[PDB]
Design an enzyme around this catalytic site. Structure first.
Site, mmCIF file in Angstrom:
data_model
loop_
_atom_site.group_PDB
_atom_site.id
_atom_site.type_symbol
_atom_site.label_atom_id
_atom_site.label_comp_id
_atom_site.label_asym_id
_atom_site.label_seq_id
_atom_site.Cartn_x
_atom_site.Cartn_y
_atom_site.Cartn_z
ATOM 1 N N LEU A 22 0.875 -1.186 0.000
ATOM 2 C CA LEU A 22 0.000 0.000 0.000
ATOM 3 C C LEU A 22 0.919 1.246 0.000
ATOM 4 C CD1 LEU A 22 -2.695 -0.983 2.625
ATOM 5 C CD2 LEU A 22 -2.577 -1.392 0.144
ATOM 6 N N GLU A 30 -8.883 1.589 9.300
ATOM 7 C CA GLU A 30 -9.232 1.213 7.908
ATOM 8 C C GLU A 30 -9.084 -0.285 7.731
ATOM 9 O OE1 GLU A 30 -7.429 0.486 4.790
ATOM 10 O OE2 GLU A 30 -9.561 0.177 4.120
HETATM 11 N N1 LIG Z 1 -5.634 -0.565 -1.943
HETATM 12 C C1 LIG Z 1 -6.027 -1.816 -1.831
HETATM 13 S S1 LIG Z 1 -7.331 -2.142 -0.920
HETATM 14 C C2 LIG Z 1 -5.384 -2.929 -2.539
HETATM 15 C C3 LIG Z 1 -6.198 -4.212 -2.875
HETATM 16 C C4 LIG Z 1 -5.331 -5.162 -3.678
HETATM 17 C C5 LIG Z 1 -4.073 -4.891 -4.032
HETATM 18 N N2 LIG Z 1 -3.409 -3.703 -3.649
HETATM 19 C C6 LIG Z 1 -1.982 -3.515 -4.157
HETATM 20 O O1 LIG Z 1 -1.752 -3.576 -5.580
HETATM 21 C C7 LIG Z 1 -0.578 -4.378 -5.887
HETATM 22 C C8 LIG Z 1 -1.157 -5.728 -6.350
HETATM 23 O O2 LIG Z 1 -2.114 -5.364 -7.394
HETATM 24 P P1 LIG Z 1 -1.764 -5.586 -8.978
HETATM 25 O O3 LIG Z 1 -2.751 -4.890 -9.759
HETATM 26 O O4 LIG Z 1 -0.429 -5.071 -9.208
HETATM 27 O O5 LIG Z 1 -1.813 -7.162 -9.051
HETATM 28 P P2 LIG Z 1 -2.833 -8.336 -8.938
HETATM 29 O O6 LIG Z 1 -4.134 -8.050 -9.562
HETATM 30 O O7 LIG Z 1 -2.977 -8.592 -7.439
HETATM 31 O O8 LIG Z 1 -1.974 -9.535 -9.627
HETATM 32 C C9 LIG Z 1 -1.740 -9.568 -11.060
HETATM 33 C C10 LIG Z 1 -1.647 -11.018 -11.506
HETATM 34 O O9 LIG Z 1 -2.612 -11.572 -11.128
HETATM 35 C C11 LIG Z 1 -3.236 -12.467 -12.080
HETATM 36 N N3 LIG Z 1 -4.518 -11.921 -12.566
HETATM 37 C C12 LIG Z 1 -4.902 -10.644 -12.384
HETATM 38 N N4 LIG Z 1 -6.092 -10.453 -12.922
HETATM 39 C C13 LIG Z 1 -6.387 -11.759 -13.486
HETATM 40 C C14 LIG Z 1 -7.574 -12.387 -14.279
HETATM 41 N N5 LIG Z 1 -8.687 -11.681 -14.607
HETATM 42 N N6 LIG Z 1 -7.511 -13.677 -14.668
HETATM 43 C C15 LIG Z 1 -6.382 -14.312 -14.295
HETATM 44 N N7 LIG Z 1 -5.323 -13.900 -13.588
HETATM 45 C C16 LIG Z 1 -5.397 -12.594 -13.228
HETATM 46 C C17 LIG Z 1 -2.199 -12.555 -13.158
HETATM 47 O O10 LIG Z 1 -1.316 -13.539 -12.732
HETATM 48 P P3 LIG Z 1 -0.384 -14.330 -13.746
HETATM 49 O O11 LIG Z 1 0.577 -13.338 -14.309
HETATM 50 O O12 LIG Z 1 0.290 -15.458 -12.986
HETATM 51 O O13 LIG Z 1 -1.395 -14.819 -14.737
HETATM 52 C C18 LIG Z 1 -1.610 -11.124 -13.066
HETATM 53 O O14 LIG Z 1 -0.172 -11.130 -13.426
HETATM 54 C C19 LIG Z 1 0.194 -4.429 -4.475
HETATM 55 O O15 LIG Z 1 0.871 -3.130 -4.325
HETATM 56 C C20 LIG Z 1 -1.026 -4.490 -3.519
HETATM 57 O O16 LIG Z 1 -0.630 -3.945 -2.245
HETATM 58 C C21 LIG Z 1 -4.116 -2.740 -2.925
#
Ligand SMILES: NC(=S)c1ccc[n+]([C@@H]2O[C@H](COP(=O)([O-])OP(=O)(O)OC[C@H]3O[C@@H](n4cnc5c(N)ncnc54)[C@H](OP(=O)(O)O)[C@@H]3O)[C@@H](O)[C@H]2O)c1
Ligand SMILES: [Ca+2]
Length: 186
Positions: A22, A30
């Protein structure tokens, strides 16, 4: 499934993450909110399901996995099996959705919660299904490398009130934020 729920916290620039975490330092209140919302089921003998992306799952400290009292579903196009501690692995949101409707699950699950990240939120938002989006708006900007997708304000109507969601601006650690609930009726 009847409807979806998505919960996220966002700062002024729509960032939700940075360097695998985050963008802001820890906020207790929160956090409790997030725990309470995703864990509480309105039916005895049932539990909530949380869906999240790979990066998100890995962002949770290992000892804290899976999120206790919820069925953890991780999405990934890459993994061959559910990561250690996760309940199920699905290749797409659709797959996860189908899974849920499965017999074994169908009867075990109350509410479905989408916990991100970006691609996950987006996919859930596009489904032509009843969906409630719980947003915590942190009224400050923090450097972020990951962002919340754009919400269709024509589809998602901001509620002016919701049972058990405080209306006022909240403050904690010198930071202010507000809870908002958006609703899409299909
Ligand atoms: N603020 C809040 S509440 C919050 C909530 C969540 C996350 N975060 C933050 O955001 C970051 C993580 O989020 P992000 O956007 O970078 O990554 P994510 O969505 O958590 O991960 C991405 C991976 O997830 C898989 N994926 C994502 N969408 C998919 C779908 N529709 N079907 C299949 N696989 C899917 C894929 O894996 P593969 O490459 O293996 O296919 C993609 O490479 C971290 O900084 C975390 O702290 C914050
Ligand atoms: Ca990948």
């Amino acid at each position: 499934v009847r409807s979806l729920n998505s919960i996220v916290a966002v700062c002024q620039n729509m960032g939700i993450g940075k360097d695998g975490n985050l963008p802001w330092p820890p906020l207790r209140n929160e956090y409790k909110y997030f725990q309470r919302m995703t864990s509480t089921s309105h039916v005895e003998g049932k539990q909530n399901a949380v869906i999240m992306g790979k990066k998100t799952w890995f962002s949770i400290p290992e000892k804290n996995r899976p999120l206790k009292d919820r069925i953890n579903i991780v999405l990934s196009r890459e993994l061959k099996e559910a990561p250690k501690g996760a309940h199920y692995l699905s290749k797409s949101l659709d797959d996860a959705l189908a899974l849920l409707d499965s017999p074994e699950l169908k009867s075990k699950v109350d509410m479905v919660w989408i916990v991100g990240g970006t691609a996950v939120y987006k996919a859930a938002m596009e489904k032509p299904i009843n969906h409630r989006l719980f947003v915590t708006r942190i009224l400050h900007e923090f450097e972020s490398d990951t962002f919340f997708p754009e919400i269709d304000y024509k589809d998602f109507k901001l509620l002016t009130e919701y049972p058990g969601v405080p209306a006022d601006i909240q403050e904690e650690d010198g930071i202010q934020y507000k809870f908002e609930v958006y609703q899409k009726s299909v």
